[PDB]
């Protein structure tokens, strides 16, 4: 259990010190890479998304898209995801693809 | 007859107390009337200047 504990410690320390939500860190790390690991690039995305959030007054989604990442198809999924916020409220007439 | 006299004394003191409460109400409402009187007296001098 050691390595997973180290990973979770890293992420939880970051989010608690940074006002970041678990899904937000999920999205930013996935957008950085499918590894789920952290490097300078992850913290780069973190900083710039929060900076643009502060200045232009947008949510975490808009900033994360702005930094160079993609629009996330699979958010928390207990609520409407970001992608379906963009193109699925409502569907035009049929289901999206 | 002890009991009936006691009932009488109870209602008479209660009636006097009700009178006293009415007196307090009259006093406060007269005070409030006076407050309005002087307040609108001041309104008069404002209006005339």
């Amino acid at each position: 259990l050691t390595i997973f504990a180290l990973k979770l410690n890293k992420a939880i320390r970051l989010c608690l010190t940074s006002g970041l939500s678990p899904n937000e860190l999920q999205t930013i790390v996935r957008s950085d890479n499918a590894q789920g690991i952290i490097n300078d690039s992850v913290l780069t995305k973190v900083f710039y998304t929060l900076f643009y959030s502060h200045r232009y007054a947008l949510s975490f989604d808009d900033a994360q898209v702005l930094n160079g990442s993609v629009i996330n198809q699979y958010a928390d999924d207990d609520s409407v995801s970001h992608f379906n916020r963009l193109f699925n409220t409502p569907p035009l007439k049929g289901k999206i693809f | 007859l002890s009991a009936t006299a006691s009932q009488y004394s109870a209602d008479k003191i209660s009636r006097s107390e009700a009178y006293r409460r009415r007196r307090q109400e009259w006093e406060i409402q007269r005070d409030n009337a006076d407050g309005e009187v002087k307040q609108m007296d001041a309104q008069l001098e404002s209006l005339k200047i």
């Binding site: 300078d40 | 004394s9 008479k12 003191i13 006097s16 009178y19 006293r20």
Partner: protein, 195 residues
């Protein structure tokens, strides 16, 4: 420099801190401990008074939280399973996460701590209570001695009964005098009525 109301040298220095911490960039310009302190000292020099109080407040609270955490993770005195913030609150008999907006005096704080210790003792929430001494005279009246005001009233009674003496009603009365009393309870008592 004028935007921050400060010297150009220190803004140079703040920018000079390449926050890359031993490579991934030029190099680590991380200031030493004392250099950090001096940079902070100079940088905050141009701050007003009410802002000074706000900074003191924020720093005091942050230091309090860090200290509480450190004592949890470091020193574990035997005899207590202190495992949270309120555990330290109870064992050190003083609140540790209140806002700084509250103010008090030494005597008030000591009063509160000792009261809470006594209360903890009585309810047997504390293990190894010396239950022999819990039966003392003072604790019997703990209902009226848990408060300073009540204690003051009951103490000031015996030396100064006059403040608390009420001729109008007392206990030990004879219903005969009480009947007088209710007979002299009318709205207006002229001479012959009281006679």
């Amino acid at each position: 420099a004028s935007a921050l109301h400060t010297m150009p040298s220190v803004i140079r220095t703040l920018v000079n801190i390449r926050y890359v911490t031993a490579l991934n960039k030029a190099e680590s310009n991380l200031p030493s401990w004392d250099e950090w302190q001096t940079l902070a000292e100079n940088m905050e020099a141009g701050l007003s008074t009410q802002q000074a109080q706000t900074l003191a407040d924020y720093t005091a609270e942050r230091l309090s939280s860090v200290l509480c955490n450190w004592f949890l993770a470091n020193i574990q005195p035997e005899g207590v399973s202190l495992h949270s913030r309120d555990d330290l609150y109870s064992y050190f008999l003083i609140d540790n996460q209140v806002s700084s907006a509250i103010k008090t005096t030494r005597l008030a704080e000591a009063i509160a701590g000792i009261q809470l210790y006594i209360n903890r003792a009585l309810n047997r929430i504390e293990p190894n209570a010396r239950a022999d001494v819990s039966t003392r005279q003072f604790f019997t009246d703990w209902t009226v001695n848990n408060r300073y005001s009540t204690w003051g009233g009951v103490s000031r009674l015996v030396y100064y009964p006059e403040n608390y003496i009420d001729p109008t009603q007392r206990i030990g009365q004879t219903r005969m005098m009480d009947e007088l009393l209710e007979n002299i309870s009318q709205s207006k008592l002229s001479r012959d009525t009281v006679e």
